Every structure is written in C-alpha cells, then in structure tokens.
Design a protein around this ligand. Structure first.
Ligand code: HEM
Ligand code: HEM
Ligand SMILES: [Mg+2]
Ligand SMILES: [Mg+2]
Lengths: 298, 298
C-alpha cells in the first residue's frame, strides 16, 4: 500500500525530479498510474536493485486531485528564519532510489515519458552515497535515522484515515562551501555538528553548543522524539556545485517543521551552526499518497 | 616503464573526467602530478575493492614544455574536423578516473583538485556511468569490438619502446544526444545509422549497410590491418537535461584516432557519420599520457 521509495534503507543512489505543472492537472492522474506501474515492472526486471520510487504532490495540485479531502497538514513550503531557508515550492516531486544508478536513470526516463510535456522540470538531482555513508563534510550521515521497516513505518507512514499509507515529504538542496569547512579545526567542526568526525560518537548534549546541529534537530516533546525518515544523499561535482540533497519523510509534517523552526532561528533565535559552511537553496513540501490512492486517480 | 593505472581496466562502472587549462606556471604541474599519482596509490590501498585507476595527461603546449620537446612525436593541438563539424576545445590538462565505485572516484577527483589547486582552471567535469547492458543512451550496446584483454589492450594503447614507452595518446570528445530526434527514427533506420542491430547487437554486413553507418566510418583497415583504439567512453548527464556519451579513447598512435575522425566528419570521402542525425560533439581534445616513471621524472 505504501509507495515503494519511502522505506528502503541504505540506497546507493537516487534521482530527485522537481517539476511544475504546465498543463491540465488531470494529466497528472494517468501519468502517476503509468509511473508507479513502470516502477513495479522495473523491480521485476532488476530484482537485485532494491528499487523504489515516490510520486508526491504540492499543496495546490494535491488539493485539486483530492477534492480537498485529507492531507490536513499540507501547505506550501514557507520560508523559515524569515528567508534564511528559501522557499521553492513546486507541484510535483519524483524520488527514485536503488542500489544501481543505471536502473534509476532508466526509471527517471520512464517518469519523464509518463508525464510528458505536462510538466516543467525545475531541477533533477543525482544523489550518490559517499564513502562510509558520510556527508561531503566528512561526517557520517544516517546514524540515528529510524532503522528497520517496523520503526520506519511508524515514523513515516500514515496509520489510518483517508491518507493511510501516505506520507509527507520535505526536500531541500544544500550547497556546501568545503573551503570554508576546511578552514575550521576538526574540534570546531565536531562542536558544529554535535558528533565526533572520524569515530562518529555523539557529543553529550550538555557539553555541546545549543547551536550544534544535533541540538537543533534532536527534539523531544515530553520525552518523545520528533523522528523523521531521512533519505538524503550527497550530490554534485568536485569542482562545481556540491552538497547534500536533503530529503525526509514523516507521517506528520509537524515533526519536520519543528526541526526547521529550530534550525533557522524561529523557535529560540538561535541558528544551526552548519550555516557557517553550507546553505539551503531550495525548499518544498509534498504529499505522497498510498498506491491505492494513486490508482484511484483515474 | 609502467603504464598509468586508468588506461587498461575493462568494464568500469563509473568514471570522472576533468578538463582544465593552465592558469599559472607550467612548472606547478610537476609537483602536482607527482602528488596526484601518489594520492591514487593511497586510494587504491584504502579501497582495494574499487579497482581504481587514473590517468593524468597533457595537451601539446604544456607537454612540449614539460618534456623539453623530446618524444610524443604525434602530439598536436586537436584540430577542427569536417571544417567545424567536430569542434576543437583543446585544453592543457586531462584527468581520467575510473573504478567500480563512483564515490571513490569522487574522492580522487577532490584529491586531484587539491593537488593542482589554483594552477588550473577547470573547464568541465563529467561524471560517466555505465548504463543497462553497457548500452549507450541511444539504446545500442557500446563496447562489443573494443580490444579485449590486457595483452591486446596493451598492444593497441600502450607505446612499446623508446622515450615514451608506457605512455599513450588520449582523445576526449563530449557528445550531446538528442533522444527526441532519435526516437523519431524507426528502429531499422537507427540500425542502418549504427551498423549493428539494436536489441540483439548483431553486426550488419558492410555490404548491407550505408557507407555513412558508424561502423562503416570507424571500422577502418589499412592493407587488412585494423586501426584499433581502446575506448573508455561512458554515458553521462541527466534524464531531463543535457545527456549523451563522453567519448574517450587511448591509442599508442594518435594516427589511428585521427583517421577515424577524418572518416566520421567528412574529410576522407566527403561522407559523414550518420549518427550526426541525432547527436553532436561539443568538445574535442588530444592529450599525451606519460608513463608513471616519466611522471616521477617530472
Ligand atoms: C547540510 C544539511 C545537513 C547535513 C550535512 C546534515 C548532516 C547530519 C549529520 C552528520 C547527522 C548526524 C548523524 C545522524 O544521526 O544521521 C545528522 C542528524 C540528523 N539530522 Fe541532519 N543534516 C542536514 C540537514 C538536516 C535538516 C534540514 C534536517 C531537518 C529538517 C535534519 C535532521 C536531522 C535529524 C533528525 C538527525 C538525527 C539527530 C539525532 O536524533 O541524533 N538534518 N544530520
Ligand atoms: C555519439 C558518439 C558515439 C557513439 C554513440 C558510439 C557508439 C558506438 C557503438 C554503438 C558501437 C558498436 C559496438 C562496439 O563495437 O563498441 C561503436 C563502435 C565503435 N566506435 Fe563508436 N560511438 C561514438 C563515437 C565514436 C568516435 C568519436 C569514434 C572514433 C574517434 C568511435 C570509434 C568506434 C570504433 C573504433 C568502434 C568499433 C568498430 C568496429 O571495429 O566494429 N566511436 N560505437
Ligand atoms: Mg538522540
Ligand atoms: Mg570489424
């Protein structure tokens, strides 16, 4: 029932396509069915790829396609920090991930064929897992991410109601200034992230700055962590633009927003220390329906 | 005389090519090249399962200065062929990294950039990927008649004796495929354009294909002896944006490559390669890849 791209762990490669609707919103109905059917066919042709994909929709298009039912939390991505985190809300998100980039590429071509000239691609980003699953900063990325299908479902997949089997998705492309990073001592970098670099051990929350990344995003409400399922990957070229393509799924948009309010100064006036070397340049919220809901579009 | 490690490996899944001009004193390339090949050895030691190789190669002007004009008798700036049908974008430095792991290639690319630093101006960085069934993005298998096995590939690509023993000539040319234009062609028309059948990759007899077919352009014999080259080309690009083939070939004789270019681009018999109906080259350069010992003697 859940779209196949939310739950797989440890993908080696991904493709994200962000697009605006140029034509009739009804063109997205048949296109989405064709695409998720294509994904199933590719899974059968390439069983070792552990392929999955997600089609997700921006607020205005999803309100139209759903007749206003459900997706109670969905909204256009606002700026956070009054503009520190920009807003680039689009109509359509396609997320493809697997162990084999060459399979992802074929699936992306299938997606473009399905939607045709109804969509205007705003960016297409090819993510790759780097050495030791580290972000390009050199810090391991993923350690506290929900692990195993059971917990990942609990965090990311809506349990009941009209949206059962769906998920909220957030995507935000960051551009790393690695020269600025390399000007910082390793201890300074470690206090910026909140974990040690080589060994990847958490620095005690009582002993690290409240601006450290972990202090910004490891949030609890009455002892209950506001968890999300991250699917982020490095992207780019060594000599040109490079960074992290951040992607997160959650059964509640709330959990993602609270982390963004924290990181970008809205909650307590303090900003994530990572902004000293990297910055976000896109941002969008999308709703990923269940597969049954996609099939019911037309 | 040891060959650089990136010339001979077969069926690499991923590559990075960096093309750059010299910004500073050519003498800066001496230590930088020695650092780079040492870095390559380090990454081979750290990631034995990547089966990494790399090549540093030099354009005519730079190499004439670094070598004092000795050897590399065939090296020259890449000319335009076909009066401009093949454009010329001769740069000073080529770095070619290939392996089983794109993420290791990326680290090696970063090492190259750190070693050469501001002595170079990067003109393009291209990330190649092997596609399904080793097909070019046109859908045709690419590599079938490439020299196979270390012994034959050495014979074709690696200079055997003299001052340049262990070295090789390199040609790189980036192509931009118009897949929409390709898909307007019937499969039989496409097969007459290439000279092999599409699905089964059977060679079409030379008396059964047009003289403009790719194979008729490049499968050249002189007194019965084929003018062989070692191709390392890979697909590159995004599904929605620029995509094509990054063509790369190694040969102990630049002559073999040039004869094929004169054929493809109309200079030999007034006919040109049928592939120009859907794809076009947008860069072109010749480089000399010295032996590893010669790099140590820089
Ligand atoms: C440049 C952008 C980012 C980079 C390089 C980055 C990197 C990291 C690293 C190195 C960790 C520690 C290891 C781990 O547990 O995964 C981490 C953790 C985490 N990140 Fe980020 N991150 C970025 C952006 C974001 C954003 C935008 C959000 C949320 C809106 C976020 C949410 C989280 C969460 C929830 C954790 C787990 C914290 C914990 O419970 O310990 N990250 N990230
Ligand atoms: C868009 C650019 C190109 C594409 C898509 C392409 C594709 C192909 C394909 C599909 C084959 C047949 C399978 C094989 O034997 O590998 C082939 C063969 C070959 N290509 Fe190309 N190629 C391109 C450019 C070039 C260039 C620029 C050269 C030479 C300068 C070249 C030289 C060769 C050679 C020598 C062969 C082997 C021919 C034989 O002996 O049968 N190719 N190529
Ligand atoms: Mg924690
Ligand atoms: Mg032949």
């Amino acid at each position: 029932q859940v779209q196949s791209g939310i739950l797989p762990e440890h993908c080696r490669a991904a493709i994200w396509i962000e697009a605006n609707l140029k034509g009739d919103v009804n063109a997205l109905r048949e296109a989405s069915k064709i695409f998720v059917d294509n994904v199933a066919t590719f899974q059968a042709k390439f069983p070792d790829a552990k392929l999955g994909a997600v089609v997700a929709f921006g607020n205005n298009v999803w309100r139209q396609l759903s007749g206003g039912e459900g997706a109670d939390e969905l909204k256009d991505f606002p700026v956070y920090g009054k503009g520190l985190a920009p807003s680039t809300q689009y109509d359509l998100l396609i997320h493809i991930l697997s162990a084999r980039h060459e399979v992802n590429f074929s699936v992306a071509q299938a997606a473009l064929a399905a939607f045709g000239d109804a969509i205007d691609v705003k960016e297409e980003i090819h993510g790759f897992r780097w050495v030791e699953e580290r972000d390009l900063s050199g810090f391991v990325d993923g350690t506290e991410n929900p692990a195993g299908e059971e917990t990942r479902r609990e965090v990311a997949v809506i349990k009941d109601g009209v949206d059962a089997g769906g998920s909220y998705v957030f995507v935000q492309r960051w551009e790393h200034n690695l020269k600025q990073l390399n000007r910082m001592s390793v201890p300074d970098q470690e206090m910026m992230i909140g974990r040690t670099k080589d060994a990847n051990e958490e620095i005690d929350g009582d002993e690290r700055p409240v601006t450290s990344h972990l202090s910004r995003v490891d949030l609890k409400e009455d002892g209950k962590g506001l968890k999300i399922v991250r699917q982020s990957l490095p992207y780019g070229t060594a000599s040109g633009t490079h960074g992290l393509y951040f992607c997160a799924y959650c059964a509640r948009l709330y959990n993602i927003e609270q982390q963004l309010l924290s990181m970008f100064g809205d909650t307590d006036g303090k900003r994530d220390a990572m902004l000293r070397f990297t910055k976000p340049v896109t941002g969008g919220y999308y709703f990923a329906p269940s597969l049954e809901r996609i099939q019911a579009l037309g």
